[PDB]
Amino acid sequence: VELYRALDAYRARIAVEYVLIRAVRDEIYAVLRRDGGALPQRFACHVSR
């Protein structure tokens, strides 16, 4: 049981960057839903109709 605890603690340690990336994913999808999919320009670039 002690080594099982060590394994699950190691799993908890290793996942920091991946849960941060998943949080970024979920935020991206949430704001894409919130704005109705209409995305305004924030970086200057010429466009064509």
Next chain:
Amino acid sequence: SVLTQNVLSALEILRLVRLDLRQLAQSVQDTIQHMRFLYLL
């Protein structure tokens, strides 16, 4: 200052052989449950 006698002394060691068989069976079972408890997901 003949075989039936020595076979009994051999059996005296075969008893310890049985004990070691039990210990190895216990070792194998312990390994199997330990591996099941930890590694499997």
